[PDB]
Each structure stands twice: as structure tokens, then as C-alpha cells.
């Protein structure tokens, strides 16, 4: 034994235990989700209200990269911020050299290679976050989810954090019941419901819902936060479904 004391060491199984321990930090975090709709993507996250003293709507979790990509993550929040900072540098250099905004699959690999690089040496620690991200490019909508190992794939729907099992089951129903697809406005409503349903694994404290979206028709392919009336409408739809 001792194979789990140092990053980048293969165990006799062929496993990197330090990466598996980073996943435990992710599983300990709050629930975050992503839904791919007809012409875009929707992101939503559960924000635990630890105290009344937290200023409502102020501690924003979802982050924008460039102007067309949204990122949300569960686990160690600072690690997620570090990853988004790198993503913003990658997107800037791509646009600097190639003029066009970075395509989502291209952006996915940039994050992937960077996270994977933190599994190659014992002088660094793996990322303690799973990141759900995506947006609209010239080939349409894309949704991705990236793990501490550096592994990522494209998704129809994605979920991570403490209530991921509940969320996944809800996402699977939507995929089955809508083979033709989901509208952006429908996806915002559904995202609100799924976070409310996933909050059962975190039922002790109450929470604040935060939603964002990129849609070709609804936001012109730019990342925007769901605010005011549209947010309240989604909260009402969600509250109606849990009762």
C-alpha cells in the first residue's frame, strides 16, 4: 500500500486513487445540472443558504467564459474558479489567433487537457470539481461534463453533486418523453423543477435557485442569467410540481 498517498501513482489495479478521492469532494458539493435544448443549453445550480445573513442573489456561482459559454461546477468552489480562469485564457488566445470565438468542442478539450495535466505529477493535486459547461457555436448547441480525471463527454443532460442520482433520473425521463427535443423556455422550467427535486438530498437547509442559458433564438447565442419574471415563473412551476 501507500499508492494513494501520492498523485500520478498507478495502484496495482491501474488506478489513480488521488483522482478518486477528488471525486469524493465533488460528491460532497451542492447539486448542479445542465440541459441541452433545441437551439441552446440551460445551466442551473443549488445554492445552500447557510444563514439568514447571506445576501440573496449576491453570491453568484455560474460563470461566463468569453460571451457564448456558461460554466457551473460542484465541489471545491475555488478549484472551479481556477479552472474557469484558465478557460478564459484559453478562449482569449484562441480568438486572438483564429479570430472566431472558440468552438465548444475545442473549448472542452482545452479544459480537459489542463485537468488531465494535474494527474501527471505528484507536485500538484487533482481538481476537486466536476464542471458542467457549454454554449452555442457555428455547429449548434453543445453540453459537456468534465471530471477530476480529465475525462469529458458530450451530453443531452448532465448532473453532479450530492443530488446527482435524483437529477439524472429526472433528466432521463425528459430524454425519453421528448425525442423531438425541448424548447429553451421549457428547459428553464424543467431545470428549476430538477434542482427543487434534487434538493431532497440537502433538505436540512433551504436554498436559492440560480439559472442561466444560451439560446440561438432567446439570447442570440450569448450566455445570460435568468432574472426577474422569468426566474419567478420557473420557481412557481417548480414549487407546483413538488406539491
Amino acid at each position: 500500500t501507500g499508492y494513494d498517498l501520492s498523485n500520478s501513482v498507478f495502484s496495482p489495479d491501474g488506478r489513480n486513487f488521488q483522482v478518486e478521492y477528488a471525486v469524493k469532494a465533488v460528491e460532497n458539493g451542492t447539486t448542479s445540472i445542465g440541459i441541452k435544448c433545441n437551439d441552446g443549453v440551460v445551466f442551473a445550480v443549488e445554492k445552500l443558504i447557510t444563514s439568514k445573513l447571506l445576501v440573496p442573489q449576491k453570491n453568484v456561482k455560474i460563470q461566463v467564459v468569453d460571451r457564448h459559454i456558461g460554466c457551473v461546477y460542484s465541489g471545491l468552489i475555488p478549484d472551479g474558479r481556477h479552472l474557469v480562469n484558465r478557460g478564459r485564457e484559453e478562449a482569449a488566445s484562441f480568438k486572438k489567433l483564429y479570430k472566431t470565438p472558440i468552438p465548444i468542442p475545442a473549448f472542452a478539450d482545452r479544459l480537459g487537457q489542463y485537468v488531465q495535466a494535474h494527474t501527471l505529477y505528484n507536485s500538484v493535486r487533482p481538481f476537486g470539481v466536476s464542471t458542467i459547461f457549454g454554449g452555442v457555436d457555428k455547429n449548434g448547441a453543445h453540453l459537456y461534463m468534465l471530471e477530476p480525471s480529465g475525462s469529458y463527454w458530450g451530453y443531452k443532460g448532465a448532473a453532479t453533486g450530492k443530488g446527482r442520482q435524483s437529477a439524472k433520473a429526472e433528466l432521463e425521463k425528459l430524454v425519453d418523453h421528448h425525442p423531438e427535443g425541448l424548447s429553451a423556455r421549457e428547459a428553464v422550467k424543467q431545470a428549476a423543477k430538477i434542482i427543487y427535486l434534487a434538493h431532497e438530498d440537502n433538505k436540512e437547509k433551504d436554498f436559492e435557485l440560480e439559472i442561466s442559458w444560451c439560446s440561438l433564438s432567446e439570447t442570440n447565442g450569448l450566455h445570460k442569467f435568468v432574472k426577474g419574471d422569468l426566474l419567478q415563473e420557473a420557481i412557481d412551476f417548480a414549487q407546483k410540481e413538488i406539491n
Partner: protein, 250 residues
């Protein structure tokens, strides 16, 4: 990141042993047998092409490598370690000699450069020793024909004939009985094939045996005519057919 292993991974134990070098020599011992014999008018180096799969094309894996037109090398131990050492040896023959003196290095000095590289992997920070022993055969104008063995420690010794790897102890005894200072190159090739047969289990033919010589200049392998002083390489790898012809007179 940064390589933060700036300390030696090979150190002296209380008994004075350098563990990592000893263990590298153990890896060489497990390796497939290779040998070298020096004649009056040439040198022969030989080994078995132990194919990992019959679907593998073993002609694409070269165990005997040309280092310079007059110097060749064979190994026992870890193949990948050998391959990168051949790359480094080919380059150092140019950078530290041919680009300075306008001629290829003598055998003993190229051996010296390869040895230095292997010594440094035994003392430098954050590396292990090379897991190979090399047999280097060559010719140069002032030293004539020569054969050298280089070990993981970086130590090298000149031989009349020797063997390394799996069945080296038995092979060296076989060579002691047959070697004399009057052997012609064809006699040395014959002895090489006899010696190698003892350590080979399965098929023994031109397709499973790799054999090369350092002998006469080959003007037919030069690729150009017109310069009298350029007469062609002394290193030549024997073909599958050439080996089989000498296996009938075996």
C-alpha cells in the same frame, strides 16, 4: 509542475552497493542472449529476434543497429532503453566528433561517449539507470577492428569475444574453447551461429536470427562513385538468405 526530483535516485547502501545499478544488471540478465566475436579481418555481432507475436513483423524491429558506417551495436535487456541510446549515440558521433574533425569517431571514443551517457543516468537527479548492456563492434584506421561491452554503470571493456544476457555464462565458455587469434571472418560467423543455437529454443533460421558484421569496405553500398578515398561502409547486416546459406554448412 517542474521536475522537482533534483536528487539522486541511485545511492550507496551501507554495504557499498549501488542498488539501482545492480537491479539494472538483473534486468539485463533476463534479456535475450546477444554475442560478439572478433576475427583477424572483421567482427561479428549476433542476437535472436524474439518475436512477441507471430502477427508482428519482426523485420520492423531492429536489434542490431548501425551507429556509424564502420560501427554497429547490439544489446541485451530493455529494448526501448536501447532504442533511445542508439538515437543519442548516432547524434553524439556527429555533434562531439564529426562536426569537429570531419570524420567519424574511432570505436573506443564513441563507446566512451555512450558510456558517459549511461554513467550520468546513474548519478543525475530524478532518473534511473539504463536497463541494457551493449555490445559495440567497429573498425577505424589506426586501431583496426575492436569489440566493446558497455554496462548500466557506464563501465566498458574490450573483448576478443563475449556474450551478454540470458545464457551468457554458458556462451562465454563455448567461445573460450573455439576462439583463437587466427580466425577469419567466415570462421567467426560460423562460431557465432553455433554459439547462438544453444540459447535458442524454437525456430533457428534467417528470419529469427539477426546478424551483422564489421568487415571489408562495401563500395556497392556507398550510393555514389567518383571519390577514390571514399570506399563505403564496413558495417553490413546479413540478409535472411545469407544466414540460411551458412546454416547448411553448420
Amino acid at each position: 509542475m517542474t521536475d522537482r526530483y533534483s536528487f539522486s535516485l541511485t545511492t550507496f547502501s551501507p554495504s557499498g552497493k549501488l542498488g539501482q545499478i545492480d537491479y539494472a544488471l538483473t534486468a539485463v540478465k533476463q534479456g535475450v542472449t546477444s554475442l560478439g566475436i572478433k576475427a583477424t579481418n572483421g567482427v561479428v555481432i549476433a542476437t535472436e529476434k524474439k518475436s512477441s507475436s507471430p502477427l508482428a513483423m519482426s523485420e520492423t524491429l531492429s536489434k542490431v543497429s548501425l551507429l556509424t558506417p564502420d560501427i554497429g551495436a547490439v544489446y541485451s535487456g530493455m529494448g526501448p532503453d536501447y532504442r533511445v541510446l542508439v538515437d543519442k549515440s548516432r547524434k553524439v558521433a556527429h555533434t562531439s566528433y564529426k562536426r569537429i574533425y570531419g570524420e567519424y569517431p574511432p570505436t573506443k571514443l564513441l563507446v566512451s561517449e555512450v558510456a558517459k551517457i549511461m554513467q550520468e543516468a546513474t548519478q543525475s537527479g530524478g532518473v534511473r539507470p539504463f536497463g541494457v548492456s551493449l555490445l559495440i563492434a567497429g573498425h577505424d584506421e589506426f586501431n583496426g577492428f575492436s569489440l566493446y561491452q558497455v554496462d548500466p554503470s557506464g563501465s566498458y571493456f574490450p573483448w576478443k569475444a563475449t556474450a551478454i544476457g540470458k545464457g551468457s555464462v554458458a556462451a562465454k565458455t563455448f567461445l573460450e574453447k573455439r576462439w583463437n587469434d587466427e580466425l577469419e571472418l567466415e570462421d567467426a560467423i560460423h562460431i557465432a551461429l553455433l554459439t547462438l543455437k544453444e540459447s535458442v529454443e524454437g525456430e533457428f533460421n534467417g528470419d529469427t536470427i539477426e546478424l551483422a558484421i564489421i568487415g571489408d569496405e562495401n563500395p556497392d553500398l556507398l550510393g555514389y562513385t567518383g571519390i577514390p578515398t571514399d570506399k563505403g561502409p564496413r558495417f553490413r547486416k546479413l540478409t535472411s538468405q545469407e544466414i540460411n546459406d551458412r546454416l547448411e554448412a553448420l
